[PDB]
Amino acid sequence: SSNARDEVIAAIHEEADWVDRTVYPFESRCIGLSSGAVHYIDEGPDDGGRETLLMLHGNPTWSFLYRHLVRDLRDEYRCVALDYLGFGLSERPTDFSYRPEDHADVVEEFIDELGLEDVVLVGHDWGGPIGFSYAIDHPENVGGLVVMNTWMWPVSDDKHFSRFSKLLRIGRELCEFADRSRFTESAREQYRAANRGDRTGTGIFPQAILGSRAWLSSLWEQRDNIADIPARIIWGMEDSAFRPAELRTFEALFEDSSTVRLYGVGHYVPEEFGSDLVPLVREFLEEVHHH
Amino acid sequence: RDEVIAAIHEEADWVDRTVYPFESRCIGLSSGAVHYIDEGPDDGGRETLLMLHGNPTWSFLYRHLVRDLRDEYRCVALDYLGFGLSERPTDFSYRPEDHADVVEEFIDELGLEDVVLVGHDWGGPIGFSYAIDHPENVGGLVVMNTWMWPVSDDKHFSRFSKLLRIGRELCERYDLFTRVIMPMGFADRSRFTESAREQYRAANRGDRTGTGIFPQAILGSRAWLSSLWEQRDNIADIPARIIWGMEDSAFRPAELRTFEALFEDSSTVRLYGVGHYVPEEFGSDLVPLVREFLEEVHHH
Amino acid sequence: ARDEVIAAIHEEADWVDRTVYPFESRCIGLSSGAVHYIDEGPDDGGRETLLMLHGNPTWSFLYRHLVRDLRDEYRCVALDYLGFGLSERPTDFSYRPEDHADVVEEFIDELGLEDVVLVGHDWGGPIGFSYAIDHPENVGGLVVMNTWMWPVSDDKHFSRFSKLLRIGRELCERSRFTESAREQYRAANRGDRTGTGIFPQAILGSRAWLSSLWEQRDNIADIPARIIWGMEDSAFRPAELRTFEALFEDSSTVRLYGVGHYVPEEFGSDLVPLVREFLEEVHHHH
Amino acid sequence: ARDEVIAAIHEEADWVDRTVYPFESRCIGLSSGAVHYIDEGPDDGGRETLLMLHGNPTWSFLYRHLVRDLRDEYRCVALDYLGFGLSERPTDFSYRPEDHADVVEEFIDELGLEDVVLVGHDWGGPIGFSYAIDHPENVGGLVVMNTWMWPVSDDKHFSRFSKLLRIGRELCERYDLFTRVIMPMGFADRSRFTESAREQYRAANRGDRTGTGIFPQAILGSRAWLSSLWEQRDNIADIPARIIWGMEDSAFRPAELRTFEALFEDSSTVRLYGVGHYVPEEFGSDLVPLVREFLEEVHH
């Protein structure tokens, strides 16, 4: 497995000069987990800081999505962000399913290797369900939830998500008005560049929206594990994928929670709202710090 | 008021009583007089039920429940002002936030206790707007295709409310609500029986102002809906049975999931092949699902 | 007679912009003098009764947007203080806030309003808060905009403002009104201007009365209130806002960035949904 | 161990005028760094226990007048934050106010202080309230002097001062304009900021004074923490409080004082006309009866 770490770090020299370290200044680090070698950010004060944050991306994004948080919270907080296998700088193993139920096991295996504790989970798109796994069955070790444009329920009866899955594709390209397109051409290329190579994970996810109903049920049916974890929900209101209908569902679920509604903001909240997200997260981290 | 109560009685029965066998009773309330069902055992019923209709429906919507559950239960069902045979007063607002005041005023004059509320469509919010401030007089909730939150940011609800806001004056002219909106609320177009279809269309004539104000109020009453949602935890622990027409395009499963999160004492019936008007389309087959709830409630 | 004298002058006061101020003008002969007031709503008295109290040097034209857009379901009442608007300007009244407070109680009693929601801006704070201090059982809730309820004679900010030399408060202290609106105020501030000049003095001249409200503020601390703050206001800073946020157990704060002192004017029709969100909350305590 | 090196700086800190600071120098090796502190009183625990928390660029010498005289009957504890007085100046610490409050919690628990009365001045307010707000049953009362507990990023008053000192930090640190310039304008009578004390504060704040310079930045930069306090203000409001305020302070106005008078359910205010920001200096031993008066009333 230590050989698998070499494979990633070799790729960092052979195939990662394109990463714009001016906006992604963070040190690259790698762990050879059993399913394969992940790439991760871990940056913060050497104390380990006021809190440890774990940031989980979606499809077809990667940890570059969180660079605004990591840059501005690594002052007082330990920021950790993980490239899923198949994505970012992580290994692209032939062996793996890329099914959400299996990515969730990689996240748990990642947490329990690094020994992260009382973590705050930041979750976007599939990073919701994937992170809610560890919150469903390790709620003692989760400090709080940062929720953005995602869900925690089976959706196979709603024609909306059904249509999105059943449509023909190789993978989810980023784009399914305040401006005609929502990303800087700089960032849009940094995402496209990471989606070079084996992109299989980008197409398994939209299929698994229906194909993992059992796993989504396995979260939804024991959601009561999570309902008293403190949470803040930060929602791109102009998202076509996750409507305010999904938002109302979380506003019922949580006892101790607060909601930020971002009008004019679409799906990729940590891009489109940028560094204005930081004070909303930081407000929550200090609210969490009273334990 | 007294001549109006008599006027409500004496020309009532264009109704097919052979399917609506109930004794019609009338209350003089401050806003005007209302017509209601009150049917059950002569002793204090095993449980007490109050059934609140959607638009443009009326107590006749619940006839299948009353017909069977009056074996054991006090079935109450009420026509709001403007609907069924209730008064159509010149001065009332027909606002849903005011209907909830009238249902409070009604409930206090009947003095119901540990009430189980059956909420369809607008009857949901109208019921919840009593249960959320008298929760310790409410015994349980039967939820069918409804909601309890402001939908003003969802394009899905927006388009329909805007469209019917625009077309209101025309829809009132020719009753497009019963002639079109009700027909589309079924998964089997034949199940909206020719008798029922004609009965609704006969009922909702004269002044029908209430039929057209409701689809505006989806957006127009956001402040009241907001107040309910902000108070939601006053209701989160009452027992609820949720029965949902899975073919309804108005209230998706995405609304259903919100009730499933709101109520911890709840369970859900997914009526695949049933549309919005579950008490019509599922008919007498609905009755056992209400009994299964009322047993678990009464056995505590 | 005294109310008939207002009937005379208001028939001469055809300058009022009845396009935006269509409301039926009504008048009461109170003991201190004749007041002019709005009373608009359904014949039912509606879901709530609102009393709306203006500031200096404004008048009930300030609240026209609330009245116009709430009168379909709620009873909106708005009062011109003596000395202001179309109300009488008697030689014998003090125009001191501690006496306006008594007139507001008298007005409420003679109209017979019950479980009122009070809407207050500038001096319409303390003057309204006086009633809510000593009849808190008759108050359904409070709408709080850019005002205060405490003695400030040690605060250099309010001290300078009162100790500055003037005839009366001018509206503006590159502009935040329409000239339609400005003239609608400036016309009413023609004639006997006296009350406009006592208000800025009484900020210090009535410190004792302001103490009396402050020292019994617990009479009010659990009345529900919604606070709606013009954040660019120089007169009533966030420093005042924090003091209300501490006082009220049951309250919410709405912060209007880019809005100045005259929140009802500068926020206009967009204020109405903030009040409805409050009225439909208060209605469940009732 | 590093704490023994803190004793080594004591073995070189003869400059501390013990004729006015007649207290035993004590040290705790906390995890973030070693802190110097005072602990004085009756030979077994006094009638009540005091913990005294200072502002910028002050230190426990600010409280010398209280420790000198209240140790007759009370346990006086007084602390130097990391970065200040004779406490350690670690190279890795943040010197953030919200981290000082974590060190103060860690200090309180290591000493096992119980039913504490907290004295807070300037930043010592927030730093103290960030314990009393989540351990209210371990706190008996609050002494409040010229301080606050809320974000002020919308107040151009506090914004102007913080932004100015954010810009000027690089020079204000190098030349110590905090003690030399900022402290004097915190007095209503410069003759009451004695030439002795002015040296004492300036001697205590030579060396690495990073923490003195970050403090005025944090007025804005700590907004998230200040919010997390202010949103929980009701956790403190029932604790009894004595407020003693320098009315000639331009930094914390009586408009801040009104906020505390609104917040507390049980409070008394002392209005020191003719006294500035540094009340414990400028009001000296005359302050002490106002603290004793409070502790005698706290003692039920």
Author numbering:
A (entry chain H): 5 to 180, 194 to 308
B (entry chain G): 9 to 308
C (entry chain J): 8 to 180, 197 to 309
D (entry chain I): 8 to 307
Text of the article:
Haloalkane dehalogenases (EC 3.8.1.5, HLDs) are a group of enzymes that catalyze the hydrolytic cleavage of a carbon–halogen bond in a range of halogenated organic compounds. Here we probe the structural organization of DhmeA, a subfamily III HLD‐like enzyme from the archaeon Haloferax mediterranei, by combining cryo‐electron microscopy (cryo‐EM) and x‐ray crystallography. A distinct catalytic pentad forms the active site of HLD enzymes: a nucleophile aspartic acid, a histidine base, a catalytic acid (aspartic or glutamic acid) and two halide stabilizing residues (two tryptophans or tryptophan + asparagine) (Janssen, 2004). We show that full‐length wild‐type DhmeA forms diverse quaternary structures, ranging from small oligomers to large supramolecular ring‐like assemblies of various sizes and symmetries.
We noted that the solvent‐exposed L10 loop, connecting α4 and α5' helices in the cap domain, displays a unique feature containing two glycine residues (G173, G174) in DhmeA. We thus constructed a DhmeA mutant lacking these two glycines, hereafter referred to as DhmeA∆GG. Importantly, the DhmeA∆GG protein could be reproducibly crystallized. The final model contains 10 DhmeA molecules in the asymmetric unit and has a low deviation from the ideal geometry. The 3.3 Å crystal structure reveals that DhmeAΔGG forms a ring‐like 20‐mer structure with outer and inner diameter of ~200 and ~80 Å, respectively. The crystallographic ring contains three types of assembly interfaces, namely di‐, tetra‐, and multimerization interface. An unusual striking feature of the DhmeAΔGG organization is that the first monomeric unit in the homodimer has a complete, properly folded helical cap domain, while the cap domain of the second monomeric unit is partially unfolded and distorted. Notably, the electron density map between residues R181 and D196, encompassing α5′ and α5 helices, is missing, and this part could not be built into the model. Therefore, we suggest that the cap domain of DhmeA protein may naturally unfold, which leads to an uncovering of the active site. The exterior of the ring together with the multimerization interface has a highly negatively charged surface, while the interior is decorated with a positive charge with the highest positive surface charge density around the tetramerization interface.
